[PDB]
């Protein structure tokens, strides 16, 4: 009864279709879009053997390049306008996870490309398999290429996680990264709040793989760069090994680089990142203390949206149960200054 694009309830006229007219409009730019793909999974997604074992979940996700031919999707081999991310073979339901999270991000007001869930043509009367589709952000209105760059390259960092030393420690942090960003984009307060909330919400939602290749710079309005939209936002809470590996992808504070110093929350009885650690991050960004208090109050008010969006999503419940456990836990830690 919920929309496979917007996760909003369907309206009788749309219930049988499974997609609201609002969602089909938002994705394609046309209301006559066919979200039922005309190809099966195995027709274009060829599974390679063995893969790896120590890779992050994103490294197992296949990517297909899609284009919109007269309201119908068609797989191209080079330069598409859409990207289709099916669930990896070993992580069933990941596409519904990315769709759930990125819908929440969009509902919380972040800059998110239009996205949704498309289904593969069935093979033999099995349950329909749905995959995650998203519009590419390095294209403009006429589908013309827009230049972009990932942060690992801009910061001249050789590793997604900053493991650039003679040990196993990380030498780039979210604080250090934010200081780099304000040096090269427009320093307005609206940008600083958004970036601060991206970091707090990656922690709250369990995205411990927001590394330097998941930040981007878009060269749209002339030579001045802008922060790229949210992407690759998945909650790792349903997967306990990958989740218990790290609290976030990067150290939160600059004092933590190289394992030289611990975040204040690590010395507390909670032993993880807490609210005072995120206050110190905001302080370094130049956010006023009065503002951060209000910023924290807003985040508390948004758990209503967080509960709702995940509960009306298409993930498996034991996965939804996992995300809300992590969220409620870390949202509780924000109160400790």
């Amino acid at each position: 009864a919920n929309c496979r694009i917007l996760l909003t309830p369907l309206n009788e006229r749309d219930e049988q279709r499974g997609y609201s007219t609002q969602g089909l409009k938002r994705l394609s730019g046309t209301a006559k879009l066919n979200p039922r793909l005309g190809f099966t999974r195995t027709q274009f997604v060829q599974e390679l053997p063995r893969q790896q074992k120590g890779m992050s979940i994103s490294g197992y996700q296949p990517k297909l390049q899609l284009v919109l031919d007269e309201g119908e999707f068609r797989v191209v081999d080079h330069q598409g306008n859409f990207i289709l991310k099916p669930s990896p073979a070993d992580f069933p339901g990941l596409a519904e996870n990315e769709h759930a999270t990125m819908t929440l991000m969009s509902r919380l007001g972040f800059d998110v490309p239009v996205h949704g869930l498309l289904s593969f043509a069935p093979q033999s009367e099995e349950e329909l398999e749905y995959a995650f589709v998203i519009r590419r952000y390095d294209r403009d209105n006429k589908g013309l290429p827009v230049h972009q760059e990932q942060l690992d390259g801009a910061m001249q960092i050789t590793d997604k996680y900053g493991k650039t030393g003679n040990d196993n420690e990380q030498y780039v942090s979210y604080e250090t990264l934010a200081r780099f960003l304000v040096a090269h984009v427009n320093d307005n307060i609206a940008f600083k709040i958004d970036l601060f909330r991206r970091i707090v919400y990656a922690w709250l939602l369990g995205n411990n793989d927001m590394h330097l290749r998941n930040f981007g710079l878009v060269y749209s309005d002339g030579l001045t760069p802008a922060l790229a939209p949210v992407y690759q936002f998945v909650s790792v809470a349903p997967y306990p090994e990958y989740f218990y590996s790290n609290y976030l992808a990067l150290p939160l504070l600059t004092r933590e680089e190289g394992g030289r110093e611990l975040a204040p929350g690590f010395h507390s009885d909670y032993g993880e990142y807490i609210g005072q650690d995120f206050l110190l991050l905001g302080e370094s960004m130049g956010l006023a203390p009065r503002l951060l208090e209000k910023l924290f109050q807003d985040i508390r008010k948004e758990n209503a949206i967080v509960m709702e969006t995940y509960e009306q999503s298409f993930m498996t419940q034991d996965h939804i149960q996992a995300v809300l456990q992590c969220y409620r836990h870390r949202l509780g830690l924000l109160h400790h200054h």
Binding site: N186, D187, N188, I189, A190, F191, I193, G222, L287, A288, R290, L291, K294
Partner: protein, 70 residues
């Protein structure tokens, strides 16, 4: 992209226009800058009687740079 300020009202009108395109409400500016909302509504229409430091502060928190030429 350079615009010469003609009158103080001109600067106040541009800054308020900039503020709205960034989606920033007045309460956020009060919390960040410490300038009262009443003084902010003042600045965004005619900042003639507003301290220069506040106008300069609001321009910075909005990403606006001030220049002088001859």
């Amino acid at each position: 992209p350079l615009l010469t300020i003609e009158t103080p009202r001109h600067l106040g009108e541009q800054l308020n226009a900039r503020r709205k395109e960034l989606g920033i409400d007045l309460y956020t500016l009060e919390l960040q800058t410490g300038i009262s909302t009443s003084t902010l509504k003042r600045l965004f229409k005619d900042p003639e009687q507003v301290k220069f430091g506040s106008v300069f502060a609001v321009a910075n928190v909005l990403g606006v740079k001030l220049c002088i030429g001859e």
